[PDB]
Symmetry: C3
Subunit: 412 residues, 3 copies
């Protein structure tokens, strides 16, 4: 069987590369939703990650940059980040990995040629190509019923194809209730100005109608470093009186992405969000006091990772997932995954892509799978050295859990 | 001499493997204490570490689990964590390492056969076997005069054999004084309800009588993330008015294990403790204001490790030790030991086992020694490359300090 | 071209070793300043880093140590840290690396011979030797107009040679204004007891006169973990009403070294400073509200590093630099540099020496360059594997930025 690191390394890498991936959180959409689905070499280069980076070098003002056309911005970013300096950053490295995967050749640095490749395909075609290259079988979307464009599709009866699943984003409802309350009553949900039984019932109705319309795998929200629960606030009262009860009834997990400090640099748009360490008290309280509720959690601060792992050791109704945003870097992904496996075995979800542009699925999963594989190799090899015997079939099983089964199993 | 990494690597590993270990903190007992000393493949599998992990997978309710028999629980944990998924976690890896060390063969996964091995031995026999395999020469125990069972032995005149040393655990006195005060006066220590000269003298008497009865290498307590000193509280007043003065007089170190948040998940029993980052202010104050007192410290939060190292650079009356609990994982042990050696040389104690079940001493020390060795190899090799010459005898000396001499030297 | 890791590794290491270094922060002085410039094997051994370490081992009281002569202290430290135990610590390793670089041989452990080497050279000669060995082209000093000795040189018209640049240290003005205000009015700066327009104008005049007299590359200050801004305090008012306006007018960057907790152990002198994690709020506020001001920042806490990197992604007027003090260790330098490059590409300054003794420049840069090189090799190799082609000339360019261009470019 397997009784050599070399043999093991090969079996593991294969299992990992071949395993069909369920990306449980992304910003992609079923191609039939139209425009909202982004793909293009230009889309890749104008990803907010690179906008932030380009602004550290270029002399072009942020206003001017926003004034430029998508292609113009893409030309500037390519010049500033790939030509004037080596594309060593993770985000840049990712653009190259995408090109290479599609069959293009970074060696030539021919942006005009790369562009021609996309110009002759359709959304549906690129989707099949990318999902095939990245070996992604299922894509969970981020569906926000507060976005006018997005809401049209849903109200018109449009459904995503079997490859894409919905997830109900509630940020506007939980974090901006004072403004959102108006739009609710505007849509027929008679919430009053004061928080009473009437408002509670309507907000629950709102949630139920959308759960019914989207059939989401989970409801989610991104929270600031200062998040706490319980709390006398709109968010605290809504989570307690509406979200949790509804989620328990429909057995839908509540996904919390904690740690983002919104718009510390407004002019940068989506590139202007920062990070902060959060207290674990609110998450600990939710897990303990709501045993019949399920929670998916990922945190933005490097300093929250270890304790999050320990918290998962305490509560089975907590499923932690991915290396989110500023954590989505080789150095962090490696330390996070090792700490996670060492204390949780395989009872967690290693990664998600958070892709905003279709092609990212390629590098996102390529870059992470190689790291995850190395970790697996070390852990399998360690028990192997302890005289334990791992079969290739067990490896495929474990890998199946990490990249797909654990999620579906949890969302039950 | 040694002028090749390969040569060095061999000399170092040998020195490390051969060096007799003094485990300065465990939850083991001199076999003559009877039952309290745990050993068994079943004991290993039901270690709270694995209980936490199994609960993340199994459908068996926590109540049912506690309802099961030791063997039943052990069967469930083996099935859920070793058969249904690969035992890649550190705690699981450790069980295998123990089996292999005793001569059993994990390859067969024959739990019934492994069990037979233990069924035919006596406590005294297993002790000699394990201590020999783990190459542990001395074991410091955790002796709590507040536990009825444990207190019987001491009051009956029972003494541990020369291989086991006592350590006075004071958690109940320091963290639960309101409840403990009653038991004290119950034992003849006339402490009053209010904290006055009378109460102070009696608590000191209590400490002195037990110091005299146990001849402990140190007095110890585990503290929450919110620990602070000075503090107007029972703990603060007791440490100031009684513990520190008595410790100085008898020249006994005060061991503080900081960072545990007790019972965040009650149902899990010993598996329900969490972690939190602590402020260094209290430790800094103690070290500076009590120069004639010695302090042994270990912290639970990953985020406290680096600053703890720096604090050790400031005060020689501080001796830091081990990679405690949630820190006892390869990824953390490696980063901790490297930061420690880089800033403290060899003036610290790398590890302790915290073993609750006898056999753990095997993997606990096996897993850590390999990591510590790798660190040593890198550090010796670095000065070697700088034209310095290290003798095998110097290596044995350094290794002697790390695994035994530093502790005994500090406890003077 | 370069299409093999081995080939790449060689090209990178060469580029790194050959690249002339601009050390943007040190405690060295142009030799013509005289005594203040420290150099010697004895100076190296009595560097506060080793004083802290020796005190963890030796029985010599701290008073006695301070009573000893420089040579006596150097003998004690050598015996205690190099002979009685292996010099595995980073600071010790550094002393050896220095010896070896100067051509001496650590293998003999002949302290008396090493000493003879220095006894026959002059300041000017050692400077040329060291700067040549360390391949350092430019050295930024720390110039404090509050130190009497240092202030004499400046008032006497003494200028440093083209290799040394001035940096205006303002700690006494910002952190000890209540005491410093007296010395100011003492020097003709008519600041009143209360903070009014008069005081503001005089403090600005003070800053302007010294900017004019030193022509500094930046103004700097070291701050405590509790640093915050805005703040109703002398520091907060001085930064707002004087420092920032003057800095904008003269386009001089403001360098903040955050995280030092001064004198937690007074007796240890310069060896008695501790560390603490800081809030990023003050830095975030400064960067956002003063877009026309430039900021150089380095932090002392390991727990501030990642977020500092993310903050740099948000603001181009923020330039982060080095692995400061307790961060200047292999384990930390590696994690810091990897996180930095992964999120910032090459838009940052990897390291500075902080040398207090001339020869340190040798090991300081030797130890860091090897680590930085390894990171570069991994990042170049990663894009190489993505089909990108890096030329040796591009590598030399990138390396030029990291070790010199980014700084000068930023200080404009
Ligand atoms: Cl932290
Ligand atoms: Na690491
Ligand atoms: Zn997202
Ligand atoms: Zn313990
Ligand atoms: Zn400095």
């Amino acid at each position: 069987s397997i009784n050599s690191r070399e043999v093991l390394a090969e079996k593991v890498k294969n299992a990992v590369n071949n395993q069909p991936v369920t990306d449980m959180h992304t910003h992609l959409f079923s191609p039939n939703f139209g425009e909202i689905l982004l793909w293009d070499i230009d889309e890749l280069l104008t990803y907010h990650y690179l906008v932030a980076e380009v602004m550290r070098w270029t002399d072009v003002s942020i206003e001017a940059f926003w004034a430029m056309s998508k292609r113009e911005q893409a030309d500037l970013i390519w010049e500033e980040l790939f030509i004037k300096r080596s594309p060593v950053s993770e985000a840049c490295r990712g653009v190259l990995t995408c090109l290479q995967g599609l069959g293009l050749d970074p060696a030539t640095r021919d942006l005009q040629v790369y562009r021609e490749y996309f110009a002759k395909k359709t959304s549906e075609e690129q989707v099949d190509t990318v999902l095939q290259l990245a070996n992604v079988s299922d894509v969970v979307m981020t569906n926000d019923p507060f976005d006018d464009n997005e809401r049209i599709s849903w109200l018109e009866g449009k459904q995503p194809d079997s490859r894409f699943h919905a997830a109900l984003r509630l940020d506007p409802l939980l974090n901006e209730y004072e403004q959102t309350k108006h739009r609710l009553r505007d849509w027929g949900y008679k919430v009053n100005d004061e928080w009473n039984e009437g408002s509670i019932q309507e907000v629950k109705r709102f949630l139920t109608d959308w759960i019914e319309r989207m059939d989401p795998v989970y409801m989610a929200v991104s929270l600031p470093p200062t998040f706490s629960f319980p709390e006398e606030s709109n968010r605290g009262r809504i989570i307690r009186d509406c979200l949790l009860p509804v989620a328990e009834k429909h057995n839908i997990p509540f996904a919390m992405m904690i740690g983002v400090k919104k718009r510390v640099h407004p002019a940068l748009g989506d590139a202007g969000d920062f990070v902060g360490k959060a207290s674990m008290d609110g998450v600990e309280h939710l897990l303990r006091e709501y045993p019949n509720n399920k929670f998916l959690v990922t945190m933005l601060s490097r300093e929250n990772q270890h304790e999050l792992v320990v918290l998962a050791r305490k509560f089975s109704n907590l499923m932690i997932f991915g290396c989110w945003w500023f954590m989505n870097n080789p150095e962090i992904i490696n330390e996070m995954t090792r700490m996670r496996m060492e204390m949780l075995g395989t009872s967690f979800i290693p990664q998600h892509s958070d892709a905003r542009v279709l092609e990212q699925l390629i590098y996102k999963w390529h870059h992470s799978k190689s790291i995850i594989a190395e970790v697996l190799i070390d852990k399998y090899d360690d028990i192997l050295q302890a005289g334990w015997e791992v079969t290739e079939e067990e490896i495929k099983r474990d890998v199946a859990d990490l990249f797909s089964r654990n999620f579906w199993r949890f969302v039950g």
